[PDB]
Design an enzyme around this catalytic site. Structure first.
Site, PDB file in Angstrom:
ATOM      1  N   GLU A 188      67.693  28.161  68.680  1.00  0.00           N
ATOM      2  CA  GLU A 188      67.864  26.866  68.020  1.00  0.00           C
ATOM      3  C   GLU A 188      68.625  27.076  66.723  1.00  0.00           C
ATOM      4  OE1 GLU A 188      64.668  24.971  65.786  1.00  0.00           O
ATOM      5  OE2 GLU A 188      65.126  23.061  66.746  1.00  0.00           O
ATOM      6  N   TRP A 211      64.475  20.584  73.005  1.00  0.00           N
ATOM      7  CA  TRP A 211      65.089  19.297  72.638  1.00  0.00           C
ATOM      8  C   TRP A 211      65.435  18.382  73.808  1.00  0.00           C
ATOM      9  CZ3 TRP A 211      64.970  17.095  68.025  1.00  0.00           C
ATOM     10  CH2 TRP A 211      64.716  17.928  66.928  1.00  0.00           C
ATOM     11  N   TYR A 232      70.968  17.972  62.686  1.00  0.00           N
ATOM     12  CA  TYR A 232      71.044  19.231  61.954  1.00  0.00           C
ATOM     13  C   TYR A 232      72.378  19.952  61.970  1.00  0.00           C
ATOM     14  CZ  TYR A 232      65.996  18.472  62.368  1.00  0.00           C
ATOM     15  OH  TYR A 232      64.733  17.914  62.350  1.00  0.00           O
ATOM     16  N   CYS A 284      63.658  16.302  60.349  1.00  0.00           N
ATOM     17  CA  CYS A 284      62.318  16.493  59.822  1.00  0.00           C
ATOM     18  C   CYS A 284      62.437  17.497  58.685  1.00  0.00           C
ATOM     19  CB  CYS A 284      61.396  16.975  60.924  1.00  0.00           C
ATOM     20  SG  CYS A 284      61.189  15.645  62.094  1.00  0.00           S
ATOM     21  N   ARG A 342      60.082  16.164  55.375  1.00  0.00           N
ATOM     22  CA  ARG A 342      59.573  14.810  55.211  1.00  0.00           C
ATOM     23  C   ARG A 342      58.519  14.439  56.235  1.00  0.00           C
ATOM     24  NH1 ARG A 342      60.510  11.325  59.642  1.00  0.00           N
ATOM     25  NH2 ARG A 342      62.166  12.298  60.887  1.00  0.00           N
ATOM     26  N   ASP A 358      54.638  17.926  62.092  1.00  0.00           N
ATOM     27  CA  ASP A 358      53.621  17.990  63.136  1.00  0.00           C
ATOM     28  C   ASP A 358      53.065  19.395  62.876  1.00  0.00           C
ATOM     29  OD1 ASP A 358      52.197  18.699  65.487  1.00  0.00           O
ATOM     30  OD2 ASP A 358      53.487  17.408  66.729  1.00  0.00           O
TER      31      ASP A 358
END
Ligand SMILES: CC(C)[C@H](NC(=O)c1ccc(CCc2c[nH]c3nc(N)[nH]c(=O)c23)cc1)C(=O)O
Ligand SMILES: CC(C)[C@H](NC(=O)c1ccc(CCc2c[nH]c3nc(N)[nH]c(=O)c23)cc1)C(=O)O
Ligand SMILES: *c1cc(=O)[nH]c(=O)n1[C@H]1C[C@H](O)[C@@H](COP(=O)(O)O)O1
Ligand SMILES: O=c1ccn([C@H]2C[C@H](O)[C@@H](COP(=O)(O)O)O2)c(=O)[nH]1
Lengths: 264, 264
Positions: free
Chosen positions: A58, A80, A94, A146, A166, A169
């Site tokens: 990733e 994803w 991103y 995120c 921000r 999980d």
């Protein structure tokens, strides 16, 4: 890890129940800071086996400025899938913002190249930042960033990095996100001939989904074990030349993995 | 105030001498977080006298989307004189990004109203964010955003906010910055019929300038006083409708002020 489990317990003891956009429900707290000295070891959770092969691809995918899961699939990384469209695109997430942030007038900013050049020519800078939070393109993203904003810092020859997440999980994403940036720091440091410093994690809405209580309790019952050590077997001629084969994790002795449904 | 003073002594206890852009030199730490329960009182520093007047006017100025100092001059505030060009302009700084962040397809986003609508219609969102860090317009700014990114959060009828300040002048700017955002939180909360929650300050490069050491320890030898109270005498139709006169600070009994040179 000590601080991870520590936060995990804090959400349980302090969290407020919230209806989230996924009709699942969560227990959350707002505002939290965690600190990881990279010198003490790589922060890959040990109370649950995490699979680094997904984490590495990733990140590499991010650094190439790629936003289509095609590449991830080529390496069989499935994380994803639930967000991509019929063409496998996630939008300008991103990767796109890291390597080619679009200016109002049509050109693009390579934040990573900028950061590498700052670390090498002006490490005392207080503006060594990468931002994925591109207000003008949010509506085009499958999901809003995120881990949205991060800053680098250099002192006494060490490279530190603080991330502002921000939304977090705690059970699924956090172990993943932490290892990801720790990894990046190690790469930056190598490419800039610096020692790794601290990885500071700051979160906004930090939560635990209702359907994760069982596996969270299970995870809280386990004793954290010594952290592995990361070895980068090859020194690429640019931070964009790393490949999966260049990273080796050593001394990683985790507790069995724990399965848990993702909120979509 | 306790949190503020504790931060100062922390920079002094573990700060690293660092050279900086202004050539002044700093004592710097990286990564910090503190919380202020606004219900306890308005977080305006009492160990030295602060100019509430300037703080308020600056904020009103931001909310209007202004970036030229003329307004501040009309109201005898000179805190931005050093960075303004021959015409009084600072570039697309805070105000402009808050009220009109330019997108790459020709639109502009009013992040303040956006946030207002989110708190009213979807307070449990994890995307209630205002960002000043517009990487595409950074080079047109007189000074890059220091308080660069903030998030709101609602829980149990209370409005909280977390700010990420990438660079912090602990002696001079921080006192203003804290009061200014606590003020914003009160305003937002009044416009959304919410109660004030916590203001969470998170910092990146948090420093003390070398030429602020004496005044810093002088202040450090003082006892904080009880926190003042903030009274809003009017609920304007919109958050962009506030006036200096609508605010009244009660019970503010600080220690003598302490002068210090601003590094340009
Ligand atoms: C067996 C594994 C596949 C499993 N891990 C995950 O499900 C997972 C999914 C996406 C991400 C990337 C970050 C992310 C993107 N969108 C997200 N959505 C949620 N809810 N959480 C996240 O972390 C993310 C990290 C981890 C595990 O057991 O570890
Ligand atoms: C008597 C007061 C005038 C004095 N305060 C200041 O001089 C001051 C100046 C600019 C800002 C805005 C942020 C800023 C803009 N440019 C900056 N440059 C530096 N070095 N630090 C900052 O905080 C700022 C806040 C405070 C005091 O005693 O409090
Ligand atoms: C910037 C503006 C503000 O509202 N508060 C502050 O504390 N700062 C300070 C940080 C730093 O000392 C200076 C900005 O310089 P640089 O961009 O960090 O080089 O202003
Ligand atoms: O790399 C990631 C991507 C997402 N999140 C989690 C945060 C939330 O649980 C969910 C995103 O939902 P919103 O915050 O956008 O509502 O995914 C992570 O922690 N890490």
């Amino acid at each position: 890890m000590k601080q991870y489990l520590e936060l995990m317990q804090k959400v349980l003891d302090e969290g407020t129940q919230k209806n989230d956009r996924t009709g699942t429900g969560t227990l959350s707290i707002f505002g939290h800071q965690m600190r990881f000295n990279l010198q003490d070891g790589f922060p890959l959770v040990t109370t649950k086996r995490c699979h680094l092969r997904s984490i590495i691809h990733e990140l590499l995918w991010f650094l190439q400025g790629d936003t289509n899961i095609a590449y991830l699939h080529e390496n069989n990384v499935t994380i994803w899938d639930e967000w991509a469209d019929e063409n496998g695109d996630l939008g300008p997430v991103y990767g796109k913002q890291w390597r080619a942030w679009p200016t109002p007038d049509g050109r693009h900013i390579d934040q990573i190249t900028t950061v590498l050049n700052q670390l090498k020519n002006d490490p005392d800078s207080r503006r060594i930042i990468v931002s994925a939070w591109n207000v003008g393109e949010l509506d085009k993203m499958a999901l809003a960033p995120c881990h949205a904003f991060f800053q680098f810092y250099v002192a006494d020859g060490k490279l530190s990095c603080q991330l502002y997440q921000r939304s977090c999980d705690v059970f699924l994403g956090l172990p993943f996100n932490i290892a990801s940036y720790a990894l990046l720091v190690h790469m930056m440091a190598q490419q800039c001939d610096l020692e790794v410093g601290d990885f500071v994690w700051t979160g906004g809405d930090t939560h635990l989904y209702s359907n994760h209580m069982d596996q969270t309790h299970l995870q809280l019952s386990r004793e954290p074990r010594p952290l592995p050590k990361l070895i980068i077997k090859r020194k690429p001629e640019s931070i964009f030349d790393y490949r999966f084969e260049d990273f080796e994790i050593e001394g990683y002795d985790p507790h069995p993995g724990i399965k848990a449904p993702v909120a979509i």
